[PDB]
RNA sequence: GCUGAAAGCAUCUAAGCACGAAACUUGCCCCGAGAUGAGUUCUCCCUGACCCUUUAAGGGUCCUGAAGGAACGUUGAAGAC
RNA sequence: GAUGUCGGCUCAUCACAUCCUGGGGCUGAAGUAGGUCCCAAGGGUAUGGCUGUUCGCCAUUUAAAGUGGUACGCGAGCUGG
RNA sequence: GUGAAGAGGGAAACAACCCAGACCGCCAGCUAAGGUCCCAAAGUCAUGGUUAAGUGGGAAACGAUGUGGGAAGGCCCAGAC
């Protein structure tokens, strides 16, 4: 339970409220909230958030670490919005952003339109790359997966939607 | 009357 | 002398209201069946319905232990070949929540004309309110 | 969406400039008067009950006469109900004409099919007839086997057998509206519809869309 | 994915994980190595 | 698949989320309150005398016979009856 | 002191160890088309020549012409090769 | 040994298994096998543990950081994993 033991610091500019099990985080980048489970105990007796297992719960230690991990990113989100970068590889693969909607061309016979979550923002510096910014790590990762799901990188040529840092193991086609 | 030989 | 036997037209019957919120299905059902059959009365008679009227509220808020909130399957046959139907506990709650209580109690009550008569005294509601205020039921903490 | 109750006048052919012949069923849809409106607070569902046509007052029963008098409407052939959508609203005594379908391209027509009486399995279920020769003995169009010996030891429910055919409610879906003639209270729908000439007919906008 | 009773690691990169009561092997080095018990 | 600990990493899962098939529950069509748990809504009709004792959801005479139904007759693209 | 055969005909019904259609993982998967495995039983799942034949071979089709249980389903239903 | 030639209670139903040998009557009591939440007579009994699989309420070789307990060993605040 090393992760659980490590405390979470709340620097200036971040306001945190604890009301029973629901813990709220506020900051410049937005507002976040989640409902922690009963097996995890969280305290705000000092400038850092402390975590521990509630008595009587077998899974307290294992699940306590999860609460610390989410809130560590939750604080990071309100102070620095998580960023996800995707790259489009293809002969004529292009992407466009109309605001809360992303328009992509991926060789299909119909247009592709994706609706972003209310808490997510997207930018398209280049037609072959789309950059997503958001406050909560969960949704931004899910949104990136959804866009990647439209056309996963092909093993033989790597064309498709991929994360910026993704590594694609290209395989050579069967000879002859 | 049937038969079964 | 002759052992006492309850008489159907002399039995005294009273009404009760039970809140099913948070109660386990099986363990609540046994108490209802015990009360419905009249096993709690000192004048209990096997061949006479000496039970009481029970009103069940919040029938959709009953709990089930373990994973059987999704693995508990209710089977019934339509009478036509291939007419075997299944409905998990969650689906039953969504569609007709008061079936789960009635089915559980029905399987614990006696079988036959008397058993069916006992079941008629059970009145299950999905909501928190009932229209039997005229019967002024007494709160029963099962 | 609301529909209207009409009468099956018969079948007719409609020619077109291009040279196509369109078989159309002529349906007479007179003024449909609203006799009662169903409200959620009182009835638990939203619907309108309408009556069409007229019937001799001598044969109108007292309870039936009293109901029509409530809505200030003349007694019709019968009474039919139509469910109301979210935006639809009507008032007792209002008259609805065939113009409702002026903007409708497809309709749903329901009615009682022609009664064939007691029909055999060959006619009722398209059962294959057995050999008419080659030794066949009194089994030219009998149903044949109806079970599988001891294991089931019974006949399953729903087994296809001879019995009443027709004379039952039938609905035909997605019939094109060839023409709507309000000045004569007529509605021409492509194709045939259930029931014989003069039978009661119910027309609704195509639910299948 | 190959379904068989005997599920074992096949190279240094294979890892045995439990997801829904089923023992399955996930390999980041080669897709052929991914297995499920069934 | 996302996030994520147990297990400082990794991990689709243990807490919590997302997608996913002609299967499943609906959607479409027909029967359907004997659904004895026998339901709901709208109209229509009946507003008299008495008598007896085993004095009670009691029996009986006289007056009354409504809404409606049935029967009969002419019949149906309804039907073995 | 009797439970009537093989095959055909008629009419079927269930299982899923799936033939087609549907959804997936690998592929020595470029594409097209396949191989293998997993989920899936809702629907669908040839006509003829020879032979008493089931089967099988052959001809020509089909998205496919699935494998089995049901007294090797079904003669108080037919046939009797 | 039992059945045959043996009833009664138990094993849901179940001659041969378990308990136990019916002279008759009783609306008395204690027990065997087996049981005690409801159908259905008796513990929703008292303690200390295990299981999360409805395992218990069917099945092997074999496979797996499931989980509890026990005795050892390598490494480690000279900084391990
Ligand atoms: Mg003859
Ligand atoms: Mg003949
Ligand atoms: Mg026979
Ligand atoms: Mg039987
Ligand atoms: Mg005999
Ligand atoms: Mg379906
Ligand atoms: Mg052939
Ligand atoms: Mg046979
Ligand atoms: Mg011969
Ligand atoms: Mg003998
Ligand atoms: Zn590997």
UniProtKB/Swiss-Prot annotation, chain D:
GO biological-process terms attached to the record: cytoplasmic translation; ribosomal large subunit assembly
Give UniProt keywords alphabetically.
Answer: Methylation, Ribonucleoprotein, Ribosomal protein, RNA-binding, rRNA-binding
Pfam families, per this entry?
Answer: Ribosomal_L3
Record's SUPFAM superfamilies? Answer: Translation proteins
Q: Does the keyword Hydrolase apply?
A: no
GO cellular component: a single term: cytosolic large ribosomal subunit
Keyword Cell wall biogenesis/degradation assigned to the entry: answer is no
InterPro entries found in the cross-reference section? Ribosomal_uL3, Ribosomal_uL3_bac/org-type, Ribosomal_uL3_CS, Transl_B-barrel_sf
Name a GO molecular-function annotation: rRNA binding
The known PTMs are summarized as: Methylated by PrmB.
Where N6-succinyllysine occurs along the chain?
A: 38
What Gene3D superfamilies does the annotation carry? 3.30.160.810, Translation factors
Residues annotated as carrying N5-methylglutamine in the record are 150
Checking NCBIfam families in the record gives:
L3_bact
**Its biological function?**
One of two assembly initiator proteins, it binds directly near the 3'-end of the 23S rRNA, where it nucleates assembly of the 50S subunit.
Q: Which family does it belong to?
A: Belongs to the universal ribosomal protein uL3 family.
Q: Which HAMAP family match?
A: Ribosomal_uL3_B (MF_01325_B)
Please describe the quaternary structure of this protein.
Part of the 50S ribosomal subunit. Forms a cluster with proteins L14 and L19. In pull-down experiments interacts with CedA.
Q: What is this protein called?
A: Large ribosomal subunit protein uL3
Organism, as annotated: Escherichia coli (strain K12)
